Amino acid sequence: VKPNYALKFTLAGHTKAVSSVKFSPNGEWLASSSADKLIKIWGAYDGKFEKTISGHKLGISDVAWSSDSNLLVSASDDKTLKIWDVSSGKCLKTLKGHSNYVFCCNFNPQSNLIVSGSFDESVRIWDVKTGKCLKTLPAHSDPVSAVHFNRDGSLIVSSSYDGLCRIWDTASGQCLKTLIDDDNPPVSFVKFSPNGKYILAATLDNTLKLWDYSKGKCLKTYTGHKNEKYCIFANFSVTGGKWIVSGSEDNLVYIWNLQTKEIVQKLQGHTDVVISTACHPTENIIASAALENDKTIKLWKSDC
Amino acid sequence: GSARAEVHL
Numbered sequence: 001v002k003p004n005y006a007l008k009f010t011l012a013g014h015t016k017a018v019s020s021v022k023f024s025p026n027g028e029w030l031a032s033s034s035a036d037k038l039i040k041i042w043g044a045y046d047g048k049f050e051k052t053i054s055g056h057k058l059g060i061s062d063v064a065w066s067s068d069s070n071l072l073v074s075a076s077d078d079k080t081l082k083i084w085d086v087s088s089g090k091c092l093k094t095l096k097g098h099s100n101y102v103f104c105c106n107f108n109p110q111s112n113l114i115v116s117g118s119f120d121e122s123v124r125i126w127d128v129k130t131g132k133c134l135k136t137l138p139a140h141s142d143p144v145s146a147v148h149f150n151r152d153g154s155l156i157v158s159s160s161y162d163g164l165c166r167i168w169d170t171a172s173g174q175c176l177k178t179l180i181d182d183d184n185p186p187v188s189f190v191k192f193s194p195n196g197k198y199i200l201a202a203t204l205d206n207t208l209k210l211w212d213y214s215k216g217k218c219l220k221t222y223t224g225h226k227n228e229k230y231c232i233f234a235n236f237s238v239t240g241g242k243w244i245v246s247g248s249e250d251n252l253v254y255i256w257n258l259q260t261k262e263i264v265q266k267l268q269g270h271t272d273v274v275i276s277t278a279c280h281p282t283e284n285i286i287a288s289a290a291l292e293n294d295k296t297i298k299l300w301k302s303d304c
Numbered sequence: 305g306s307a308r309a310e311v312h313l
């Protein structure tokens with residue numbers, strides 16, 4: 001079986017390249033971050049603009065929701081992360097500690113911690129309540145492209161332009177594993193699978209790979225798209241058919257069958273690199289965002 | 305405008 005995603009809405013608003021889009025865990029909203037220093041909230045089902053959240057001094061590279069859909073955390077070129085209360089729009093805390101651009105961020109499952117990756121080549125773990133840095137991990141030898149907590153939050157996976165994917169013990173900060181294949185291209189994105197058994201990793205050699213974390217080996221590879229310059233997000237679509245979703249440097253959204261690795265659909269419409277995609281938690285809905293020459297977000301819907 | 309929207313060598 002194959003999906004039939006069709007364009008339903010195009011969201012205009014950001015004045016510069018959009019950097020990331022994420023659906024709230026409760027499925028009510030879509031948050032977007034942009035090089036325009038802003039975060040915008042949109043209705044997940046109707047694509048209707050809700051509000052703008054401002055505060056950062058420079059462009060934003062990533063934004064993420066807390067487990068209860070009440071908070072957001074953003075990573076910016078101003079070298080800070082900001083925790084926001086979505087309902088009030090207030091900046092609850094500004095996390096200062098990184099010495100260079102903050103590139104990626106995420107809350108842990110209980111949302112009491114935030115993990116961040118920066119151009120300073122480190123990974124930091126922060127306490128949400130106090131906004132204080134708990135640990136600084138000398139994780140890589142190049143910018144950290146992504147950071148993500150596993151299902152129970154005991155592990156953190158990080159990726160970097162240095163070509164490595166490393167898994168860290170949240171409590172001790174010890175490097176528990178370094179994953180790399182036969183080549184050393186920059187690793188542009190990583191994240192644990194929904195069940196926490198795998199790690200989906202993107203490398204700047206036009207490849208996505210599904211790794212078995214425990215065994216430390218590559219199980220599947222997804223190819224066919226273009227990705228050699230930007231850190232494009234990738235997702236696990238689990239509402240209908242089990243797919244792998246990702247933007248591409250040819251302005252398209254690619255969708256692969258996770259098990260067979262075959263391309264099942266390509267979404268056309270954006271006018272620039274699709275830097276970020278996200279899959280709704282309960283409906284077969286995909287949100288995609290593009291760079292500078294496009295500046296829009298698109299919502300696609302499928303029956304399966 | 306932001307690191308992610310730029311190319312890194």
